Structure 1
Amino acid sequence: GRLDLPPGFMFKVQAQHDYTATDTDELQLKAGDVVLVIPFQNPEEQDEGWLMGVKESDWNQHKKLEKCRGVFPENFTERVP
């Protein structure tokens, strides 16, 4: 996939449910998905219980992550050590 990693990135997470998100910049998660926790552009754009993360596949497009950026409920996902 990508050659470089996203700056500010935190870690990889694993969804535990299928949350269909349909927005202009939402993050669709599927029960058993892989998403990376990254620092959004601002916390004022983040919701309560939802953070800015990108899917594993999207990572491959890290080249244009700026267009892969999305949001997802952390309480609906799990942290991957």
Structure 2
Amino acid sequence: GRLDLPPGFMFKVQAQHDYTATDTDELQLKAGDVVLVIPFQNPEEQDEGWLMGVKESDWNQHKKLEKCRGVFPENFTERVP
């Protein structure tokens, strides 16, 4: 995996459903997935009901997180303390 953590990061979340997202900057979630809430490049980009988060696997790709970034429905996931 990576070595350093993502800056701005907030916390980790867990999906509760399987939502296949196929976009140029989407975030695929699978019922029981792990995602990290990170601060997007702007609130104007943030979608209504969806926020900018990264999957655990993407974390390992922190090297290219800029290309691992995506959007996911928060109302479809769960926050992890």
User: Shorter-chain TM-score: which interval?
Assistant: over 0.9
Deviation per residue, 1:11-39 (Å, 9 max, x gap): 00000000111110100000000000000
Partners of 2:17 and 2:61 in 1: CA distance:
24
The alpha carbon displacement at 1:41 in A equals 0.4
The alpha carbon displacement at 1:57 in A equals 0.5
The alpha carbon displacement at 1:62 in A equals 0.4
Partners of 1:38 and 1:49 in 2: CA distance:
15
Q: Match of 1:21, SS?
A: coil
Q: Which runs of 5+ in 1 are unaligned?
A: none
The alpha carbon displacement at 1:46 in A equals 0.9
Q: Which runs of 5+ in 2 are unaligned?
A: none
Consecutive aligned runs of 4 or more in structure 1 exceeding 4 Å deviation: none
The alpha carbon displacement at 1:74 in A equals 0.4
Deviation per residue, 1:44-72 (Å, 9 max, x gap): 11111100000001000001100000000
TM-score by length of 1: 0.98
The residue number in structure 1 matching 2:46 is 46
